[PDB]
Design a protein around this ligand. Structure first.
Ligand code: MPY
Length: 256
């Protein structure tokens, strides 16, 4: 039974489309965490209010070192409050901008961490959508934390494009791992182009190239993940066992 009065609210940590995050200390436990304030109006304006309610619900049952922890949540007339884990090292995206690009060990380790977390959710019948660097936070020990809340558990007149979206949902994160792996090593997304339109075509036609410095092991893994056909994409287990990942990762791969 939470209330804003239960916290000592400190400095802002970021502003988003739907809300703001602040650093906070729980008066009771003198425990440092992050308070996310979401504006119901913004959520409704985008028709995601009902969606979030369900995602937060799923999250409250997820417990994993590489998934940003949701300690609880509450609300009032116009706000939704999320009591979240405080990740002191910022986002992966920020870190990547700071270093330009990651080496193989850093990259492989992050990929393993994501795969381990996704693998765990899979075993709880929970699926994840696309993953962006902007939604990955870093813990004090440098561990990555999935922090978006993209979780989830007629047809006759719909065309492939509108249908293929709602099917093979369990293969979307695999494509994302491939994109993240490429960006971590190269410094830019593989389908980044000049225009909104150009980017579409690149992704759709699955056309991209590897800079010379990208080793063979990494090209193999990325190429297997970035396949147009979702069923052609490997299983999370295959990622966790890929020679390049196990060789370079410093974090033990733990499937399921
Ligand atoms: C703003 C709301 C929002 C919208 C969309 C996506 C996200 C996920 C990142 C969020 N944030 C969110 O949920 N948040 C939950 C969070 C959270 C954000 C967070 N930490 C930080 O944002 C942060 C930023 C900079 C930082 N630095 C320290 C070292 N450097 C010297 C300078 C920088 C250290 C920590 N911990 N839990």
């Amino acid at each position: 039974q939470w209330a804003l009065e239960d916290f000592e609210i400190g400095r802002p940590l970021g502003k988003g489309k739907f809300g703001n995050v602040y650093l906070a200390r729980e008066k009771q436990s003198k425990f440092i965490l992050a308070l996310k304030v979401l504006f119901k109006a913004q959520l409704e304006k985008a028709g995601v209010e009902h969606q979030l309610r369900r995602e937060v619900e799923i999250q409250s049952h997820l417990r994993h070192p590489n998934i940003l922890r949701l300690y609880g949540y509450f609300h009032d007339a116009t706000r939704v409050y999320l009591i979240l884990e405080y990740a002191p090292l910022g986002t992966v995206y920020r870190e990547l901008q700071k270093l330009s690009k990651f080496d193989e060990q850093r990259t492989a380790t992050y990929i393993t961490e994501l795969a381990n977390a996704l693998s765990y959710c899979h075993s709880k019948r929970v699926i994840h959508r696309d993953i962006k660097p902007e939604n990955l936070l870093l813990g004090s020990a440098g561990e990555l934390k999935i922090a978006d809340f993209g979780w989830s558990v007629t047809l006759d007149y719909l065309p492939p494009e509108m249908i293929e979206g709602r099917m093979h949902d369990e293969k979307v994160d695999l494509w994302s791992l491939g994109v993240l792996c490429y960006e971590f090593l190269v410094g830019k997304p593989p389908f980044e182009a000049n225009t909104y339109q150009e980017t579409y075509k690149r992704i759709s036609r699955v056309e991209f190239t590897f800079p010379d410095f990208v080793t063979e092991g990494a090209r193999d893994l990325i190429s297997r993940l970035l396949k147009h056909n979702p069923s052609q994409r490997p299983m999370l287990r295959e990622v966790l066992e890929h020679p390049w990942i196990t060789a370079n990762s410093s974090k033990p791969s733990n499937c399921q």
